[PDB]
Structures are given as structure tokens and as C-alpha cells.
Amino acid sequence: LEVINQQDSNFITALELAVRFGKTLIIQEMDGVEPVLYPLLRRDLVAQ
Amino acid sequence: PEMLFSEVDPDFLKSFLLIHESCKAYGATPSQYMTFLHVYSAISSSKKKELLKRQSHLQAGVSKLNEAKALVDELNRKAGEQSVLLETIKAAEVLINQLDREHKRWNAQVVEITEELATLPKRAQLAAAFITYLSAAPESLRKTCLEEWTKSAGLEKFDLRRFLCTESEQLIWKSEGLPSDDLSIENALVILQSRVCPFLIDPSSQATEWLKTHLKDSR
Amino acid sequence: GPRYVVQIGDKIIDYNEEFRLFLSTRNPNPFIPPDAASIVTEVNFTTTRSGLRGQLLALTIQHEKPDLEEQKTKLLQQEEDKKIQLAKLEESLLETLATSQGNILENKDLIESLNQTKASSALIQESLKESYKLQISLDQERDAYLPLAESASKMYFIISDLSKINNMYRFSLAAFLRLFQRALQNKQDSENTEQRIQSLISSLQHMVYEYICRCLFKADQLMFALHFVRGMHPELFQEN
């Protein structure tokens, strides 16, 4: 687990670590739906 | 090597320097010096672990045989004592009929491995130096250099193709299409190396057919 | 993060931990610089003297009589399979000693160990009798060809060094073994075999000399002749 705030300085870096390491992620102070988080909330998975 | 030691002492170290200074006359890159040290450490670790496993199994055998003999040396006597105041002898003798050869076979290897693993570092030096240098030279240079190194250590017996591989693997390699020469078998021993990539100079494709035969199992 | 990537041209590619790379080569030269040879360890499959001797010896045994060849094949294969099965049967001796280390006099594992050791002793005595029943039976039917194969292994290393004065004097080995086939297939010599061995070395030197002087330059045949004579009989010119 990692828990992060919305208006936080290290948001996208910790988001990258949470997508890579397989964490379970909780976000605190959301003011809506972020622009960044649209393909992750959808399914956008190109295969390698 | 003294920083690869913690991570007789000076005779090993000055032997390394003299081996390298003699091997500078064929092309001696310091990458080969470091490959030498890494494969030395790897082979010495694997052989120390396998020799400790062999002594552990032989010690367990020498414990269990002596314990069963000490148990069987008095059980029929206790039954005879109970009969005196007032059925395992056949299977015990049947077990002893195999144990007379079995314990006699499994005896000596305890002292054998005990005297062997005091002579592992120089053997690992020779086995590493052969792999990290002499897979290129013609066989006269193999013979001359192995003889000079063997006289340098002082153990003029004690070959290496039996030290590093046993008979069963040789006949299994022969069962596939490996050529049966000394050169072909020593070349197939050198591709034990996995620090670097092996490079097969091969005019007729038998050794390649053999390698892609017995690498069937993995992907 | 947890993985590793490695550069291949322009792409960025995950380096899987099960990566093992081997690569073959058909010509000892080409090609290494002195930069890509301090990381790549080089192995040269080569035909040498003692191997080529046994190769031609096996060819002569197979071309003398097929029965001795089939016998020396089947006996060696059965001896190898018996050695592997003997190691397998003696590989249960650790189990019979310390499979559990308890109630070894009680359970019938010690009873089955007696049967296994009986099988081991039977196979050991049988392999002793077999290794006695193959040694002189193969030596006297295999040693009737080696004074042919000895000088036939001399001649190839004679004609190997012909390139070092004139280029395109480079000779293969597949055609050489084709010649060694042609020595049998055209002979049809019915005599004593010990009278046949000098006949076959004699009718092989002619075919070697004619096959090489098909190729040579006209100012080189005396060179080839004298070096060939120095190669075959090194005793008739003594020392210094």
C-alpha cells in the first residue's frame, strides 16, 4: 500500500512506482477526475 | 584477489601474478584476468558445497549403519534372556550379507573427501586458468602449459577432465554425436563457462549438432 | 523499477533473466578485432592427429568386414548402458543408508536393499566377465588396420602445409575422405590381409599424388615430391 494526497509534490513519480511495483493505491484529496488518469482508468494495454 | 578474498595466503597471490606474467605472451587482457577470478570463485563455491554434501551423506550412512548394528547386537540376546528366565535374525543376516560389501564400500570416502577438500584451491586455479585462457591454442600449447602449471604446483598426477566431469556424463555426451577426441571433450568442457559468450570455431558442423541436440529441453 | 532494459539499436527491450546466447562459425579466420575478443571466449573445433588416426582406423575396420564392426559397436553400447544402469542401481545406496535413519532393522526397506545389492553384485560380475569377453576379442580384429591408418594420418598433415607458399593450395578433408573411400572401392585385392596392407598403402600413395598434382603449378611439382618423401619416410635421411 501507498497513500498519497492530490495536491502533492511527488504525485506522478509515486504514481509511476505504484503502476510498476504492483501496489494497491489510495488517493486522498481528489477534487474530481484528473486528466492524467483516463487510460489507466480505462483499459489501454499495448502488448510487448 | 585480496579484495576478492574477504569479499597460505601470499603464495596463492604470487602464483596468480606469475601465471599472468607467463600468459602475457599470447594476449592477456585485464578483462580475462577478471573473468579468471570470477570463474575461480564460482567453481570453488560449487565444489565446496558438493563435497560437504557428500561428506554429510556418508556421515549419515556411517551413523545409521553403526546404530543398527549396535541395536541388532543385543536384541536377539534380550529375547534369549526373556526365553531363559521363562524373529529378526534371518533378515539381520540377510541384511549383513549385503552390508559386508556395502559398508566396506561406503567406508573410505569419508577420509577420501576429507583429504580431498584440502587440495581444492590449486585445482580450482588450474581449472579456471584452462577455461579462461586455453580454449584457443593448439593442443601442443595445451600440453606444454598444463605440464608447466602442473609442475609449478607440484602435483604431477591429478588430471582435470576427471576432476571436473565424470564418466556417466561423458558417455551420455558420446551418446548423441560429440566427437570422442581429447580436444572435442575438453572443448565441450570449456562451454561450462557462462561469464562470457562461447565462440565456436567449427569447420564441420558435428559439435554444433551436438550442442543443439542436448539443449533440446529448454527453450 | 525492478527489471532491467538493454539497448538493441533503437528499441528499448526488457532483458529476461533466462537469456543464453551461443553462436557458430564456419571459418577460423574471419573475424575478430582486438576489442570484441576480450569479452568473447573462443573455441576451436580442430582435427588433430590422435583423433584422425582413430577415425581412419574405424573406417578401415568397417571396410574390412562388417561383422567385427557390428560386434564392436553392440558390445560398447551394451557396456555403456550397463555402466549407466549400474550407477543407477548404486544410486539407491544413500537411500538404503539414510533414507529416514530410523527403524532400519524393523522395516522391509533393508529387505529390499538386500535384493538391490544382489542385483548390483550380479551386474558387477557380469560386467567384469563382459569386459574380459570383449578386450582380446576386439584387439585382434581391430589391430589389423592401424599400420594403414598411421601413415594415412601422416599424409594429410603433409598436404596441409602446401598453402603457405602459394595461395589457393588449400585442401579440404571431405574430399580427402572421399579419396580414402576410393582406395577401397577400386581395389578388390584378394590376398593375405598382411599382404593386403602394403598393397593398399601403395595404391593409396599413387592416388594422393595424382590428385594433388592435378592442382599444382608446373614449377612446384619437385617441391611437392621432395616434401612428400620427407613426410613419408623420415629415416632415410639421417641427421644434420
From TrEMBL, chain A:
<protein>
    <recommendedName>
        <fullName>Cytoplasmic dynein 2 heavy chain 1</fullName>
    </recommendedName>
</protein>
<comment type="similarity">
    <text>Belongs to the dynein heavy chain family.</text>
</comment>
<comment type="subunit">
    <text>The cytoplasmic dynein complex 2 is probably composed by a heavy chain DYNC2H1 homodimer and a number of DYNC2LI1 light intermediate chains.</text>
</comment>
